[PDB]
Design a binder for this molecule. Structure first.
Ligand SMILES: CCCCCCCCCCCCCCCC(=O)O
Ligand SMILES: CCCCCCCCCCCCCCCC(=O)O
Lengths: 129, 129
């Protein structure tokens, strides 16, 4: 019912391949590929504040689902997109050629980002605090 | 008397002044000044693994107290220095013209970085898992 929490990355697939596909330099990719950090979500109804840690970067995005917002991506580009909430537990959007699904089941968020033939999947676990 | 844990940044003083002094790009200073993320320490005796979130960056460093190590700073520069343990609860190091003190007080960690007339102070709180 609520996405709010601090989430410890547990495992991911295709980090290097995804970051390569979107144009990040290999030297940066190798520096961040094995970090497993903590991302935070604060949900208040349709409103979300994301503090995402991915690789060597921290990105802070804010959006209300259903409203167009400017979201910073891993390339530094700020993309205009709308994130929708399907049910109470799935956040979906598309930007550039990437389909993103953020799904909360119990305490586990599965984030699946699909770019052509690359499925970049992150599994994180809510720190029960 | 263990530093180990995950710590959420609670407050900080003089981020912008310190980051300017070390020459961080202004765009990174403005993006990162309000981010309050989670850093992690793993301590094994004198050996420490740090996953530090500072501004928009994640930095992973690894060293042993009393032995010279190579550490990545906030600018990405590599520096060679020795980290000492002071008074059994403070990690202290001096690299270039910076003195860093990382002090443990129960669930609170205070990182104080002094550069000339600038004292960059971070106060973080242990996440109870
Ligand atoms: C426009 C969206 C921002 C894209 C930033 C890409 C970095 C990976 C995105 C995954 C974060 C989704 C939240 C779940 C927690 C996590 O996996 O860290
Ligand atoms: C080797 C020098 C450290 C790298 C430079 C990072 C600048 C900020 C350092 C924060 C100290 C991290 C340790 C305690 C946790 C925290 O305060 O987040």
């Amino acid at each position: 019912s609520s996405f709010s929490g601090k989430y410890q990355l547990q495992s991911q697939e295709n980090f290097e391949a995804f970051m390569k596909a979107i144009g990040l330099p290999e030297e940066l990719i190798q520096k961040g590929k094995d970090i497993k950090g903590v991302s935070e979500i604060v949900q208040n109804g349709k409103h979300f504040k994301f503090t995402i840690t991915a690789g060597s970067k921290v990105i802070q995005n804010e959006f209300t689902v259903g409203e167009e917002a400017e979201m910073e991506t891993m390339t530094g580009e700020k993309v205009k997109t709308v994130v929708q909430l399907e049910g109470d537990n799935k956040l979906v959007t598309t930007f550039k050629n990437i389909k993103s699904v953020t799904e909360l089941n119990g305490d586990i968020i599965t984030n699946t980002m699909t770019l052509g033939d690359i499925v970049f999947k992150r599994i994180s676990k809510r720190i029960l605090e």
